[PDB]
From Swiss-Prot, chain A:
The modification N6-acetyllysine is found at K81. One of its GO terms (molecular function) is RNA binding. It comes from Homo sapiens. The gene is RPS21. Its main location: cytoplasm. This is Small ribosomal subunit protein eS21. One of its GO terms (cellular component) is rough endoplasmic reticulum. The modification N-acetylmethionine is found at M1. It comes from the Eukaryota. It is found in: Cytoplasm, Cytosol; Cytoplasm; Rough endoplasmic reticulum. Component of the 40S small ribosomal subunit. It holds the Pfam family Ribosomal_S21e. Component of the small ribosomal subunit. The ribosome is a large ribonucleoprotein complex responsible for the synthesis of proteins in the cell.
Curated annotation (Swiss-Prot), chain B:
The keyword Ribonucleoprotein applies. One of its GO terms (molecular function) is ubiquitin ligase inhibitor activity. It comes from Homo sapiens (Human). This is Small ribosomal subunit protein eS7. Keywords: Acetylation, Cytoplasm, Cytoskeleton, Diamond-Blackfan anemia, Isopeptide bond, Nucleus, Ribonucleoprotein, Ribosomal protein, Ubl conjugation. The gene is RPS7. It is found in: Cytoplasm, Cytoskeleton, Microtubule organizing center, Centrosome; Cytoplasm; Nucleus, Nucleolus. GO terms for cellular component: centrosome; cytoplasm; cytosol; cytosolic ribosome; cytosolic small ribosomal subunit; endoplasmic reticulum; focal adhesion; membrane. Component of the small ribosomal subunit. The ribosome is a large ribonucleoprotein complex responsible for the synthesis of proteins in the cell. Required for rRNA maturation. Part of the small subunit (SSU) processome, first precursor of the small eukaryotic ribosomal subunit. GO terms for biological process: cytoplasmic translation; negative regulation of ubiquitin protein ligase activity; negative regulation of ubiquitin-dependent protein catabolic process; neural crest cell differentiation; neural tube closure; positive regulation of gene expression; positive regulation of intrinsic apoptotic signaling pathway by p53 class mediator; protein stabilization. There is a cross-link at K63, K67 (Glycyl lysine isopeptide (Lys-Gly) (interchain with G-Cter in SUMO2)).
Swiss-Prot record, chain D:
HAMAP family: Ribosomal_eS27. Its cofactor is Zn(2+). The lineage of its organism: Eukaryota, Metazoa, Chordata, Craniata, Vertebrata. It comes from Homo sapiens (Human). Component of the small ribosomal subunit. The ribosome is a large ribonucleoprotein complex responsible for the synthesis of proteins in the cell. Required for proper rRNA processing and maturation of 18S rRNAs. Part of the small subunit (SSU) processome, first precursor of the small eukaryotic ribosomal subunit. One of its GO terms (molecular function) is zinc ion binding. Zn(2+) binds at C36, C39, C55, C58. This is Small ribosomal subunit protein eS27.
Swiss-Prot record, chain E:
It is found in: Cell membrane; Cytoplasm; Nucleus. This is Small ribosomal subunit protein uS2. Required for the assembly and/or stability of the 40S ribosomal subunit. Required for the processing of the 20S rRNA-precursor to mature 18S rRNA in a late step of the maturation of 40S ribosomal subunits. Also functions as a cell surface receptor for laminin. Plays a role in cell adhesion to the basement membrane and in the consequent activation of signaling transduction pathways. May play a role in cell fate determination and tissue morphogenesis. Acts as a PPP1R16B-dependent substrate of PPP1CA. (Microbial infection) Acts as a receptor for the Adeno-associated viruses 2,3,8 and 9. Coiled coil: none annotated. The chain holds residues 2 to 214 of 295 of the full protein. One of its GO terms (cellular component) is nucleus. Residues 160-179 are annotated as: Laminin-binding.
RNA sequence: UAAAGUUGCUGCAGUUAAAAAGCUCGUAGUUGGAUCUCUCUCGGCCGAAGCGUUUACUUUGAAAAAA
């Protein structure tokens, strides 16, 4: 990213899988970026906010996208404990 | 009475020996301590304003000192008020033989006299009524090590309050951070 | 039989990181394994780990942060002087901007940069990047 | 899968494992105080005893060695320790 | 849910689940659906933890709601047991239905007649809807699936653990998902019961309609 | 795996974590020593002694009650055998196989197994000779073996 | 000589392209699990004779014909 002078010399900063932290490639068409709507705690309705989770195509192929997304939602308070 | 090895008396050791003498004068255990002996006794601040007292015992007497350890610790907690008492034997740590030394170790250093074995025995003795049923050394992100000890849940309430005193005593005479917890399985 | 427990440990870490797992179990543990893991941790490559004490030889549960590309052992433990360190870096490291060669020197177990800083050679244990 | 906590296995999963593949190995065997109505003293019997144990106050068989756990004779009360 | 008591599961919902047989899985268990099963029965049937079912249904509803173009959600059903349910869900929620056979190349072949680019994909059965799911792996398509105990979880991002074999269970799950999505959207309230009922989403055998006519 | 077989068996004793005398065991260290001495006088090897101490006396591990291993206890008292138990049993098995082979000379499998047993015997003898348990002149022969049995 | 990673220590191959001995045992060879954190004297803030068991390793120093 940074040269000696400190300016950023990259074309872009690729995003990383929220499950494995590995970089999602430019031609990884099996990768998803899913938004989970946030809900007002009293009315239980869509407040316009959401949590964004990026999952690479490898995890989805392994069948671990379900577990990874469930765990990401649980750590965000979306999913009830247990 | 207290008999030190470096021929040096202490006033707190004198008080501890006086307490042991009082126990010998009037108790149901007078026939027990009349042969047993201690080597030293030290007070250290555990946290906040609390204090804890460590007795030091010769190894051959230690098991005998562990037949009546609970009775004696209860008696000295009653006598010394809000101060916990722990019995840790006096164990010597011989230095690791380096390449530059001279004539003080002509024989191979026994494993029991190593730092590792001595500290393991100190941990085993420091919680005597509860038995050690598991140990986990967690290395934190900065490289420091936290020891987590799992104690027998058969005798938990007798020593649960003694945690944060166990850890302070260990940190004082060993220098390692140690944690104590009780697992569901032994 | 089993030889070079460090090789087995690093292979387990590498295979778990390839699989995307957050934790790996290493058994048996050793002083060399713990020192290598600490050198790995100070550079932020694996994160925290726990030593399970069984009364014959330790085990290590290493939390895995997916920052590790390859951790490898160099068998045999070739003795490396400061002059040959650059050649070893060129052979084993993907870039001059990152990646560490771990050596055991008389000052302890440390990466190649710390070996140059302390001006010492040693025996190459492995590499990680 | 991909997030199994290896430091805190559930007790059922750890009891399911082979005694050597557990996090800390523990035996599946045990010791029992066994007591016969025709005896006035108890004895200690290994759950996997390989010899024929006899009553301390009698001449009766107490347990017969088998492939695994020994076969305690009927009518004898056995209680596990620890 | 998130421990939000407004989102907690109701007695009526539990009764609906138990009546539709939603909690009743199959005799086989995919290793990735272990975490959703309570315990196996005395006859080899796996019981589905309905708390996890409600949790995953709410997560799927949240994912559906965070798409402000409702037609960008595609609801797919190849089996007849979920075609009417999918059509009802699409009508009520505004999604785009594919009831019947899914033509391969729908998501990938730009030239085709039925070409579309959804933003989210929901299917009744990953086994019976394997063709859209695979195409989801070509166009960066998140996927929601109603998964039984033996359902394969490849390319399934939000797996709702439920019986998806019986018509009652499939219809009830689609109806509940539509109800949750509408409740999160704002239309229809969380206080009184929804004016629609699960039997609209059900599937009736042609002999049943003949009996009803 | 096995030294002389393709098996990769895993069965073995799994020791508990604790190194302490069990609560049920009232036997003192000297009592266990006396029981060991009596069992050795009866003519039982340390393996057998440990087996019957575990099975009838509740002694899970003699090392954790006495602080010493059974063979070391017997050596200290002075009633330990001249040659070690495992080597003696290997020599006994080799003698039995050789005695079988003299009356069954067409048993090539017996010859193969005898070769394997004698290789094990030689390995154990070399180990014990390096550790000075056996005299450096000790050698295993095909004639004096039955004398040692 | 490089190309030749077609001699492969770095760094090759051996199911079918060339190729694992028919199969075990076995000596030399090669390899080998965890573990152990600086003292008597001399010319009162010094200086030392050392045997601390050594070796490998590493670093330093000396010495080492120019061309």
């Amino acid at each position: 990213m940074q040269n000696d002078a400190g300016e950023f010399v990259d074309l872009y900063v690729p995003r990383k899988c929220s499950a494995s932290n590995r970089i999602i490639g430019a031609k990884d068409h099996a990768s998803i970026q899913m938004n989970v709507a946030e809900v007002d705690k009293v009315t239980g309705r869509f407040n316009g906010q959401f949590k964004t989770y990026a999952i690479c195509g490898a995890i989805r192929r392994m069948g671990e996208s379900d577990d990874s997304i469930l765990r990401l939602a649980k750590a965000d308070g979306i999913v009830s404990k247990n | 009475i207290v008999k030190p090895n470096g021929e040096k008396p202490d006033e707190f050791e004198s008080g501890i020996s006086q307490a042991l003498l009082e126990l010998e004068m009037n108790s149901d255990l007078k026939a027990q301590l009349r042969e047993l002996n201690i080597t030293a006794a030290k007070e250290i601040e555990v946290g906040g304003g609390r204090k804890a007292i460590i007795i030091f015992v010769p190894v051959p007497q230690l098991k005998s000192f562990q037949k009546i350890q609970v009775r004696l610790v209860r008696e000295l907690e009653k006598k010394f008020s809000g101060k916990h008492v722990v019995f840790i034997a006096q164990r010597r740590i011989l230095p690791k033989p380096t390449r530059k030394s001279r004539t003080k170790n002509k024989q191979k250093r026994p494993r029991s006299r190593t730092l590792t074995a001595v500290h393991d025995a100190i941990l085993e003795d420091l919680v005597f009524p509860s038995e050690i049923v598991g140990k986990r050394i967690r290395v934190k992100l900065d490289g420091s090590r936290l020891i987590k000890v799992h104690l027998d849940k058969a005798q938990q309430n007798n020593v649960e309050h003694k945690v944060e005193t166990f850890s302070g005593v260990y940190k004082k005479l060993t220098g390692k951070d140690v944690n104590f917890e009780f697992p569901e399985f032994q | 039989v089993r030889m070079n427990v460090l090789a087995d440990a690093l292979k387990s870490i590498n295979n778990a990181e390839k699989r995307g797992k957050r934790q790996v179990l290493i058994r048996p543990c050793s002083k060399v394994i713990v020192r290598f893991l600490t050198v790995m941790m100070k550079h932020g490559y694996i994160g925290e780990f726990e030593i399970i004490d069984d009364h014959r030889a330790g085990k290590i549960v290493v939390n895995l942060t997916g920052r590790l590309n390859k951790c490898g052992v160099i068998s045999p433990r070739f003795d490396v002087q400061l002059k040959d360190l650059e050649k070893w870096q060129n052979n084993l490291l993907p870039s001059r901007q990152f990646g560490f060669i771990v050596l055991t020197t008389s000052a302890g177990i440390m990466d190649h940069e710390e070996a140059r800083r302390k001006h010492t050679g040693g025996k190459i244990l492995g590499f990680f990047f | 899968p991909l997030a199994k906590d290896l430091l805190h296995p559930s007790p059922e999963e750890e009891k399911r494992k082979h005694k050597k593949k557990r996090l800390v190995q523990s035996p599946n065997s045990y010791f029992m105080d066994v007591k016969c109505p025709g005896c006035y003293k108890i004895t200690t019997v290994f759950s996997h005893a390989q010899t024929v144990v006899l009553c301390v106050g009698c001449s009766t068989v107490l347990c017969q060695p088998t492939g695994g756990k020994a076969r305690l004779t009927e009518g004898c009360s056995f209680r596990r320790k620890q | 849910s998130g421990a939000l008591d407004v989102l907690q599961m109701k007695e009526e919902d539990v009764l609906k689940f138990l009546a539709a047989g939603t909690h009743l899985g199959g005799t086989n268990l995919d290793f990735q659906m272990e975490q959703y099963i309570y315990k196996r029965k005395s006859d080899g049937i796996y019981i589905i933890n309905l708390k996890r079912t409600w949790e995953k249904l709410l997560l799927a509803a949240r994912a559906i709601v965070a798409i402000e173009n409702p037609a960008d959600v595609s609801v797919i059903s190849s089996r007849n047991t979920g075609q009417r349910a999918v059509l009802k869900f699409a009508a009520a929620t505004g999604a785009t239905p594919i009831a019947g056979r899914f033509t391969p190349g729908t998501f990938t072949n730009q030239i085709q007649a039925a070409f579309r680019e959804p933003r989210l994909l929901v299917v009744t059965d990953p086994r019976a809807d394997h063709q859209p799911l695979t195409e989801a792996s070509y166009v960066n398509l998140p996927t929601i699936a109603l998964c039984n105990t033996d359902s394969p979880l490849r390319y399934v991002d939000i797996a709702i653990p439920c019986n998806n074999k019986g018509a009652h269970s499939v219809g009830l799950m689609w109806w509940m998902l539509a109800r949750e999505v509408l409740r999160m959207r704002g239309t229809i309230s969380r206080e009184h019961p929804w004016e629609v009922m699960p039997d609209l989403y059900f599937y009736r055998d042609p002999e049943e309609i003949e009996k009803e006519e | 795996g096995r030294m002389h077989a393709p098996g990769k068996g895993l069965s073995q004793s799994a020791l508990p974590y604790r190194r302490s005398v069990p609560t049920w065991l009232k036997l003192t260290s000297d009592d266990v020593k006396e029981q060991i001495y009596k069992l050795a006088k009866k003519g039982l090897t340390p393996s057998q002694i440990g087996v019957i101490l575990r099975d009838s006396h509740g002694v899970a591990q003699v090392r954790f009650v006495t602080g010493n291993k059974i063979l070391r206890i017997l050596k200290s008292k002075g009633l330990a055998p001249d040659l070690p138990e495992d080597l003696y049993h290997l020599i006994k098995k080799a003698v039995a196989v050789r005695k079988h082979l003299e009356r069954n000379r067409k048993d090539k499998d017996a010859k193969f197994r005898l070769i394997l047993i004698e290789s094990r015997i030689h390995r154990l003898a070399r180990y014990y000779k390096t550790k000075r348990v056996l005299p450096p002149n000790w050698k295993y022969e095909s004639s004096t073996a039955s004398a040692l049995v």
